[PDB]
């Protein structure tokens, strides 16, 4: 029973949840969400194993080299992580929503390296229950190629201070399932690869005003043999590649937006969980409250059976 370390750490992610629309906003709360300590207890009591925390480090750094992080902000992230670990959740912190890196990777890649030099340094003595994730959803000008060039440089820096901490490596092109074969891996034993699933996109993002063009509402997802096979076909592809490259998978985001009808969301969400499970992917639902939310902040109650769809109990 010599098992791969990466793979055992990936099992610890289990069924997770994203803490969305909070620290990846310009300023925390400016989008409608502010992380409250109680959130993590609430998440733990419902049965989730882990929480994934989007953080826009790039909005809280110095204009001049080496791009030091505003201490208040780093103190704030340290608080939030402490509170999540206090509640026995495995905790993933990333870099998220670095607009400039998407536009000019050659220039801003070195800012991400720096950012992570400081984050790896501050978190170096944290228990192994805290995982890092270099960057969320490379895309646009941060091509598969540049990502394959950038992420190892950041990895190298993190590894100076955190020699074995799990680092999660996102698939490029928005982490879409089909870009898995474009990711070039490194000889590191403590890495996990992550994709995000939102197909059919015209279903999961119906009515999303932030998509251009914005998509029509009233699009169903009905659990039909042909519908389940689309997803199974997608995942089996990710699984075959992960197996040949000896790497574990974390489905870092999946969710359907609240403008889709509830029945389809409950069905779609359940199916993705189930298929993610069958292929031994860990998973994390997007997101806790807000527009794809499982948890209703007004009533202080989970939304059901959707939450069961996402969690499986």
Describe what you observe in this structure:
The PDB classes it as hydrolase. By secondary structure, this protein is an alpha/beta fold. The protein has a single domain (1-313), classed as Alpha-Beta Barrel (TIM Barrel). It contains 10 helices and 10 strands. The chain has helices at 5-13, 38-46, 71-86, 99-103, 105-122, 144-161, 201-204, 225-244, 262-278, 306-311, and strands at residues 15-18, 50-53, 90-94, 130-133, 167-170, 191-197, 249-254, 282-285, 295-296, 301-302. The protein has an 8-stranded parallel beta barrel, surrounded by 5 helices. A two-stranded antiparallel sheet has the order 9-10. Helix 2 links the parallel strand 1 (15-18) and strand 2 (50-53).
Task: Fill in the keyword field for this structure.
313 residues, alpha/beta, TIM Barrel, two-stranded antiparallel ribbon, 10 helices, 10 strands
Question: What is the secondary structure topology, with strand pairs?
Answer:
Blueprint: H1 5-13, E1 15-18, H2 38-46, E2 50-53, H3 71-86, E3 90-94, H4 99-103, H5 105-122, E4 130-133, H6 144-161, E5 167-170, E6 191-197, H7 201-204, H8 225-244, E7 249-254, H9 262-278, E8 282-285, E9 295-296, E10 301-302, H10 306-311
Parallel strand pairs: 1-2, 1-8, 2-3, 3-4, 4-5, 5-6, 6-7, 7-8
Antiparallel strand pairs: 9-10
Helix pairs in contact: 5-6, 8-9
Q: Which overall shape is indicated by the principal axes computed on the Cα atoms?
A: globular
What CATH architecture do you see? Alpha-Beta Barrel
- What fraction of residues sit in β-strands? 5-15%
- From the 3D structure, determine the CATH topology: TIM Barrel
Estimated radius of gyration: 18 Å
PDB class: hydrolase
Keywords: thermophilic enzymes, endo-beta-1, 4-glucanase, thermostability, hydrolase
Assembly: monomeric
Entry title: Crystal Structure of Hyperthermophilic Endo-Beta-1,4-glucanase
């Amino acid at each position: 029973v010599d098992k791969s370390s990466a793979f055992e750490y990936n099992k610890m992610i289990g069924h997770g949840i994203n803490m969305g629309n909070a620290l990846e906003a310009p300023v925390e709360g400016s989008w409608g969400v502010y992380i409250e300590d109680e959130y993590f207890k609430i998440i733990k009591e419902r049965g989730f194993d882990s929480v994934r925390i989007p953080i826009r480090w790039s909005a809280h750094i110095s204009e001049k080299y080496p791009y030091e992080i505003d201490k208040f902000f780093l103190d704030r992230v340290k608080h939030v992580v402490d509170v999540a670990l206090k509640n026995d959740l495995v905790v993933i912190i990333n870099c998220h929503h670095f607009e400039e890196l998407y536009q000019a990777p050659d220039k801003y890649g070195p800012v991400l390296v720096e950012i992570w030099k400081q984050v790896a340094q501050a978190f170096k003595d944290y228990p192994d229950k805290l995982f890092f994730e270099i960057f969320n959803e490379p895309a646009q000008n941060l091509t598969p190629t540049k990502w394959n060039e950038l992420y190892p440089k950041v990895l190298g820096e993190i590894r100076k201070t955190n020699p074995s901490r799990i680092v999660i490596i996102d698939v490029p092109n928005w982490s879409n399932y089909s870009y898995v074969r474009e990711l070039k891996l490194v000889d590191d034993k403590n890495i996990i690869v992550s994709f995000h699933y939102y197909e059919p996109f015209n279903f999961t993002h119906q009515g999303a005003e932030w998509v251009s063009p914005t998509l029509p509402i009233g699009v169903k997802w009905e659990g039909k043999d042909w519908e389940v096979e689309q997803i199974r076909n997608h995942f089996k592809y990710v699984s075959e590649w992960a197996k040949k490259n000896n790497v574990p998978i974390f489905l870092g985001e999946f969710g359907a937006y609240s403008k889709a009808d509830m029945e389809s969301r409950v069905k779609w969400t359940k199916t993705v969980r189930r298929i993610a499970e069958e292929f031994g992917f860990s998973l994390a639902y997007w997101e806790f409250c807000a527009g794809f939310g499982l948890y209703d902040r007004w009533t202080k109650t989970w939304i059901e059976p959707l939450t069961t769809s996402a969690l499986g109990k």
